[PDB]
Write a protein that binds this ligand. Structure first.
Ligand SMILES: CCCCCCCC/C=C\CCCCCCCC(=O)O[C@@H](COC(=O)CCCCCCCCCCCCCCC)COP(=O)([O-])OCC[N+](C)(C)C
Ligand SMILES: CCCCCCCC/C=C\CCCCCCCC(=O)O[C@@H](COC(=O)CCCCCCCCCCCCCCC)COP(=O)([O-])OCC[N+](C)(C)C
Ligand SMILES: CCCCCCCC/C=C\CCCCCCCC(=O)O[C@@H](COC(=O)CCCCCCCCCCCCCCC)COP(=O)([O-])OCC[N+](C)(C)C
Ligand SMILES: CCCCCCCC/C=C\CCCCCCCC(=O)O[C@@H](COC(=O)CCCCCCCCCCCCCCC)COP(=O)([O-])OCC[N+](C)(C)C
Ligand SMILES: CCCCCCCC/C=C\CCCCCCCC(=O)O[C@@H](COC(=O)CCCCCCCCCCCCCCC)COP(=O)([O-])OCC[N+](C)(C)C
Ligand SMILES: CCCCCCCC/C=C\CCCCCCCC(=O)O[C@@H](COC(=O)CCCCCCCCCCCCCCC)COP(=O)([O-])OCC[N+](C)(C)C
Ligand SMILES: CCCCCCCC/C=C\CCCCCCCC(=O)O[C@@H](COC(=O)CCCCCCCCCCCCCCC)COP(=O)([O-])OCC[N+](C)(C)C
Ligand SMILES: CCCCCCCC/C=C\CCCCCCCC(=O)O[C@@H](COC(=O)CCCCCCCCCCCCCCC)COP(=O)([O-])OCC[N+](C)(C)C
Ligand SMILES: CCCCCCCC/C=C\CCCCCCCC(=O)O[C@@H](COC(=O)CCCCCCCCCCCCCCC)COP(=O)([O-])OCC[N+](C)(C)C
Ligand SMILES: CC(C)CCC[C@@H](C)[C@H]1CC[C@H]2[C@@H]3CC=C4C[C@@H](O)CC[C@]4(C)[C@H]3CC[C@]12C
Ligand SMILES: CC(C)CCC[C@@H](C)[C@H]1CC[C@H]2[C@@H]3CC=C4C[C@@H](O)CC[C@]4(C)[C@H]3CC[C@]12C
Ligand SMILES: CC(C)CCC[C@@H](C)[C@H]1CC[C@H]2[C@@H]3CC=C4C[C@@H](O)CC[C@]4(C)[C@H]3CC[C@]12C
Ligand SMILES: CC(C)CCC[C@@H](C)[C@H]1CC[C@H]2[C@@H]3CC=C4C[C@@H](O)CC[C@]4(C)[C@H]3CC[C@]12C
Ligand SMILES: [Ca+2]
Ligand SMILES: [Mg+2]
Ligand SMILES: [Mg+2]
Lengths: 339, 415, 190
């Protein structure tokens, strides 16, 4: 397009230069308007852009005839070429390039189903004041370029999050986002999908690709069934003993329902304990005030004091809550009775 | 003498020396030949996360506007001038504004990751071309209207800073502000370019090409050119101006014809059938939702407004999420005083309070008879009666179903 | 539904996939599409539960490794890694002959919901020393309380007939106590 446009522009400008500069035989060469080649070039660009200044034009009748026969081709050529050239130049990869690994600061990588509401619901829970201050940065990775609202969300949490376009199935992309130097990889699954096995399959392939590149990383992912947990276990470096997460949304929901099925309310009792919820306060005493007093609690892990670890854990149960004003709950041990 | 070259020279040597200095630093790093904390402090200052960063970025906004108005003031001055900053108000403010801009560029350079890509950024290039020459001018006690027209390119960051300050959130307004800022910025910037080049004579012509033009005349010229009118009352007579016009219109026409229809679309495509229904005192009204099309509304309205029925003071308030076509609007304009339309779904309690369904006499639901799925249309009517009874259970719903077992499902609702 | 009582008091729990459908479940609430799922009434009552509240589990399991282990062993019934390996090898739980070490797998401190109006702990039901309440629970049976499952209008003086209770997580020491109350408590393993 560039070659054709520039060639016909300069060629027809040279034609007009010759014809305009030379006089007209009928006029006895009195039509020889004094024009330079660059003046004819400017004339033709004005004409093809359909501006039509009329400061300089063709006064010879051969020049006018050539202009009339030119503009039929030229205007269609201009209006079909220049938008195409303006499109082909500059439509590039704006979210390419590498992630600089900041020294002295870990970072995570988040891929999977990445949309505006999912990123917002993740970022509030990750950057909440109730959680301990996190120096860890968040590096996204998603093959679809984000829309303007997701870009505005990134511009909001500018210093804490970065985006980098690309699939997770490319080891060049994984080295680009520095997943080997990353602290932990996260995968967000699309809950609301038309095929709960096909979305499951895509998450399978994503965990496969990440473990194929670097098996020494912690993957926190989310599945949609329980049998797919065995498929995750099929991966050699997918070991439960090493730090890893394989959340199964359907299994967790069923377990919460089956626990509230004997103790009504326990599902939302547990589900409020993980949204990091600051202590909001309303004026009047409805049920909502006393319930937001409930939902302001979360679950945290604190190492016991030498007193607490010392003597008997069952003994250090009683009066533990009053002393620290906290709720206290080498393996999975709830209700310690009987480091 | 006519010290015009020093400003352009100073800006160019700062720009290219930083570019060359950056390359030299990379060579030193090769073959072994707290910074993060000051960097992310600069980052949280650049972003609007703190109150300090918020007042900083609103000051960047305001002083970019102020420097642009100062350029519009000084455009009426002669090209070469000799002016003392202490002696006259001129350059007293611009100096402070460019000091602040130099500070802002320093903060942005500290916060930036890649030095060469930061140097090759248009918001940095405008800084490199505007903050040196005013200091050169206030040192030399002279004035040249150099590239002070470039300050209009500080309008390019308005969408970014409103995204920082959370005024811009939705995609339509974000794209609108982007298009407006880009269009106005490049219009004023290229007009200032033509003003400088056209006003200054041509060295080959010994400066006899200095056509006397004002900045607003150049603005009018460029809007004529981008709109492809081409009056030819005023044009470029300098060959540098003509060359810039030729190289301008390639970008400018495509930009105009792709932006101005988009801005005209994004402005004004609004909700024409929003707003509340005024409950007329002493007169009941009904609410009709469901499958609402032209022939269904017409067949309903003739039976409802027929002379044989006793005179009805009751008004009819429609509610339908699809905006009506022109023929349905003409039907509403026909029965103007008796019917009103209000766009919205019935599954929104804000919409239900908007149409005043609690104050309404009776709700009506018209089902689509001719549907491809007589259970799915049944299901939609189920959900509609569910939503109306969820908002206000004390209302009379007259609806229509498609089977007989669905009557039991309607009976399932408590109210 | 009705019986020789009504069926409004019947405790049900329904899954949802749309958070924005939760307003249709109840009638005595200020329904609002802006009100989030954690804030609306029937989720707080516990009778509604959508899957979308589990998005915070990603951040939770990143910030502590033990959280998923704790939730699994509290929720699905103590999935030990031996059970997970047997699942991956068999895809069907089987039965085996018990031993004393097998009978030592009754030692899960069980979840329960007890009443406060009647029972050995009903001796106070009108206090405000919730701290003394759970300390009595400790010194009685090491019964770890969780929180008060109080009725919605139990904090009111105008007596209604609403048996919808709502949960409150971690009540403080100086929290009051009506006798008409259900409590979230964990007694020791059977
Ligand atoms: C006095 C001197 C006067 C100045 C002289 C006239 C100006 C120069 C004429 C040359 C242009 C001819 C041309 O357009 O190429 C043609 C042949 O393809 C080729 O042979 C070239 C490639 C291609 O034809 P087209 O119409 O461009 O194809 C359009 C198809 N499309 C829409 C899929 C792209
Ligand atoms: O002019 C020339 C004709 O030369 C022409 O007439 C130009 C040829 C135009 C015809 C285009 C054919 C090519 C089309 C595919 C004639 O010569 P002259 O230039 O008129 O000589 C006088 C010049 N003087 C007045 C300066 C002395
Ligand atoms: C492409 C745009 C060309 C528009 C320039 C038109 C023009 O004035 O030509 C100019 C040169 O033209 C040149 O020498 C500069 C062209 C260099 C191409 C890059 C004409 O230059 P000139 O012949 O020496 O002067 C003629 C009288 N005039 C000053 C009234 C023009
Ligand atoms: C501060 C920002 C940087 C400062 C930018 C310049 C500030 C103004 C300097 C001009 C004042 C001056 O005395 O110039 C006089 C001498 O000066 C020269 O002729 C030597 C300068 C040669 C250019 C050196 C560029 C180095 C790039 C590699 C001009 O002499 P005149 O012709 O007689 O008038
Ligand atoms: C936002 C704050 C930044 C803008 C500062 C205001 C400003 O510069 O306006 C300027 C002009 O003002 C006008 O002449 C009217 C232009 C519209 C004002 C906007 C006022 O600033 P000034 O240049 O100091 O005005 C001197 C005019 N005097 C010499 C008559 C006293
Ligand atoms: C809203 C957005 C911002 C646009 C408003 C900005 C308005 C531009 C102000 C410049 C126009 C101006 O000052 O007068 C013009 C220049 O006139 P003058 O050369 O300075 O002298 C005039 C003296 N006389 C009045 C006696 C003739
Ligand atoms: C002498 C001074 C001369 C005056 C100077 C030239 C005039 C100003 C040039 C600045 C415009 C550059 C630009 O268009 O932005 C570009 C970079 O995006 C950015 O960096 C800015 C946003 C965006 O590129 P695009 O082509 O606009 O993207 C089109 C993609 N689209 C079709 C999906 C929208
Ligand atoms: O004009 C100046 C050149 O100044 C220029 O030549 C303007 C610079 C244009 C080059 C653009 C480079 C920037 C491109 C990115 C020269 O000075 P003067 O103005 O010609 O001095 C005579 C003025 N008088 C005739 C009124 C006395
Ligand atoms: C935008 C459209 C600008 C078109 C105006 C062009 C114009 O005539 O400028 C005018 C001002 O221009 C102004 O002062 C009004 C511009 C205010 C911007 C709003 C020119 O004003 P002038 O320099 O004082 O008069 C010059 C002689 N003339 C009357 C023949 C023009
Ligand atoms: C080149 C083709 C496609 C366009 C047709 C142009 C030619 C055939 C025609 C159109 C106008 C004509 C001119 C009309 C007026 C005079 C008449 C007589 O004194 C002969 C020369 C002259 C000057 C003619 C030469 C031939 C002519 C130039
Ligand atoms: C990147 C920068 C350095 C390149 C810009 C080119 C500038 C600095 C050079 C190129 C041609 C030069 C001019 C050529 C001759 C004039 C007239 C003479 O009586 C004084 C010096 C003076 C005014 C020169 C100084 C400025 C000048 C315009
Ligand atoms: C041209 C460049 C070097 C200008 C930089 C100015 C430096 C020396 C000064 C200006 C303001 C200062 C900052 C002021 C307070 C913040 C937050 C504080 O909790 C730790 C230090 C820190 C992060 C300082 C770092 C150094 C600092 C940025
Ligand atoms: C800026 C770039 C992209 C366009 C090219 C313009 C420059 C390189 C060229 C095109 C026209 C040229 C002019 C042609 C005529 C005279 C010749 C001689 O007296 C030197 C100066 C002068 C006035 C030339 C200066 C250099 C020049 C201005
Ligand atoms: Ca409700
Ligand atoms: Mg960063
Ligand atoms: Mg009316």
């Amino acid at each position: 397009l560039l070659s054709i446009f520039i060639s016909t522009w300069l060629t027809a400008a040279g034609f007009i230069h010759l014809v305009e500069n030379s006089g007209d035989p009928w006029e006895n060469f009195q039509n020889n308007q004094a024009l330079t080649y660059w003046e004819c070039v400017y004339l033709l660009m004005v004409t093809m852009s359909t501006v039509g200044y009329g400061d300089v034009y063709a006064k010879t009748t051969l020049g006018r005839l050539f202009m009339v026969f030119f503009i039929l081709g030229g205007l269609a050529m201009f209006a079909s070429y220049v938008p195409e050239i303006i499109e082909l130049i500059g439509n590039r990869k704006k979210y390419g390039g590498s992630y600089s690994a900041v020294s002295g600061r870990k970072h995570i990588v988040v891929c999977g189903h990445i949309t505006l509401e999912s990123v917002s619901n993740f970022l509030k829970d990750f950057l909440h004041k109730d959680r301990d201050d996190v120096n860890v940065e968040i590096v996204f990775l998603h093959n679809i370029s984000p829309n303007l609202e997701l870009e505005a969300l990134f511009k909001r949490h500018f210093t804490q999050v970065e985006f980098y376009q690309g699939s997770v199935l490319n080891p060049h992309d994984l080295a680009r986002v520095k997943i080997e130097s990353a602290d932990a990889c996260l995968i967000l699954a699309n809950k609301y999908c038309a095929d709960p096995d096909a979305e499951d399959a895509s998450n399978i392939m994503r965990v496969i690709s990440i473990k194929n590149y670097h098996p020494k990383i912690r993957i926190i992912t989310q599945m949609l069934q329980y049998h797919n947990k065995a498929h995750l276990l099929n991966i050699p470096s997918w070991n439960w003993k090493e730090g890893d997460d394989a959340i199964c949304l359907a299994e967790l929901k069923l377990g919460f329902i089956a626990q509230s099925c004997l103790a009504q309310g326990l599902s939302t009792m547990l589900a409020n304990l993980f949204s990091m919820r600051s202590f909001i306060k309303i004026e009047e005493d409805t049920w909502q005030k006393y319930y937001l007093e409930g939902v302001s609690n979360e679950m945290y892990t604190e190492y016991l004091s030498s007193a607490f670890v010392g003597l008997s854990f069952p003994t250090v149960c009683e009066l533990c809550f009053v002393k620290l004003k906290l709720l206290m709950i080498s393996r999975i041990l709830i209700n310690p009775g009987n480091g | 003498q006519r010290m015009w070259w020093a400003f352009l020279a100073s800006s160019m040597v700062t720009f290219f020396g930083g570019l060359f200095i950056i390359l030299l630093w990379r060579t030193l790093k090769y073959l072994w030949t707290w910074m993060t904390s000051v960097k992310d402090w600069a980052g949280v200052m650049i972003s609007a996360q703190t109150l300090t960063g918020r007042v900083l970025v609103v000051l960047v906004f305001a002083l970019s506007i102020g420097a642009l108005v100062i350029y519009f003031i000084d455009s009426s001055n002669p090209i070469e001038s000799c002016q003392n900053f202490y002696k006259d108000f001129t350059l007293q403010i611009d100096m402070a504004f460019n000091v602040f801009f130099l500070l802002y560029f320093g903060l942005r350079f500290i916060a930036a990751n890649d030095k060469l890509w930061f140097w090759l950024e248009v918001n940095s290039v405008v800084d490199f071309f505007t903050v040196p020459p005013v200091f050169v001018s206030v040192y030399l006690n002279r004035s040249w209207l150099g590239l002070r027209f470039l300050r209009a390119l500080r309008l390019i960051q308005f969408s970014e800073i409103l995204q920082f300050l959370n005024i811009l959130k939705t995609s339509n307004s974000i794209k609108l502000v982007n298009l407006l800022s880009i269009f106005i910025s490049t219009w004023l910037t290229a007009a200032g370019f033509i003003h400088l080049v056209e006003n200054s004579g041509d060295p080959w012509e010994n400066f006899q090409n200095n056509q006397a033009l004002t900045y607003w005349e150049c603005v009018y010229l460029l809007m004529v050119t981008m709109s492809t009118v081409g009056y030819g009352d005023v044009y470029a007579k300098t060959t540098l101006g003509r060359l810039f016009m030729v190289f301008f219109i390639l970008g400018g026409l495509a930009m105009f014809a792709s932006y101005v229809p988009e801005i005209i679309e994004l402005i004004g495509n609004r909700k024409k059938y929003g707003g509340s229904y005024s409950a007329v005192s002493g007169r009941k009204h009904i609410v009709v939702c469901g499958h609402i099309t032209l022939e269904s509304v017409s067949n309903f309205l003739k039976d409802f407004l027929h002379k044989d029925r006793d005179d009805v003071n009751v008004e009819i308030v429609f509610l339908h999420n699809i905006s009506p076509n022109l023929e349905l609007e003409a039907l509403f304009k026909r029965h103007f005083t008796q019917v009103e339309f209000y766009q919205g779904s019935v599954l929104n309690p804000h919409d239900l309070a908007r149409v005043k369904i609690e104050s309404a006499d009776a709700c009506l639901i018209l089902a689509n008879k001719y549907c491809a799925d007589p259970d799915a249309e049944d299901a939609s009517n189920i959900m509609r009666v569910i939503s109306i009874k969820n908002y206000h259970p004390k209302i009379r719903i007259i609806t229509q179903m498609l089977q007989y077992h669905n009557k039991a499902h309607l009976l399932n609702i408590p109210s | 539904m009705q019986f020789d009582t009504t069926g409004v008091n019947i405790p049900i729990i329904t899954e949802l996939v749309n958070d924005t459908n939760v307003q249709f479940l109840d009638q005595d609430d200020d329904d609002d599409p802006d009100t989030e799922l954690y804030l609306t009434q029937p989720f707080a009552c516990g009778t509604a539960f959508a899957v979308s509240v589990l998005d915070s589990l990603m951040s939770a399991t990143y910030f502590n490794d033990n959280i998923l282990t704790l939730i699994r062993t509290l929720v699905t019934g103590g999935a030990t890694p031996e059970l997970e390996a047997l699942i991956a090898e068999e895809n069907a739980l089987r039965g085996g002959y018990s031993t004393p070490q097998t009978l030592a797998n009754r030692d899960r401190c069980r979840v329960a919901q007890l009443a406060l109006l009647d029972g050995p702990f009903a001796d106070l039901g009108d206090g405000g020393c919730y701290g003394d309440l759970f300390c009595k629970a400790l010194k009685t049976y090491n019964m770890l309380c969780f929180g008060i499952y109080r009725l919605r209008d139990a904090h009111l003086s105008t007596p209604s007939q609403c048996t919808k209770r709502y949960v409150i997580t971690n009540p403080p020491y100086e929290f009051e106590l009506v006798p008409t109350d259900l409590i979230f408590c964990l007694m020791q393993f059977d």
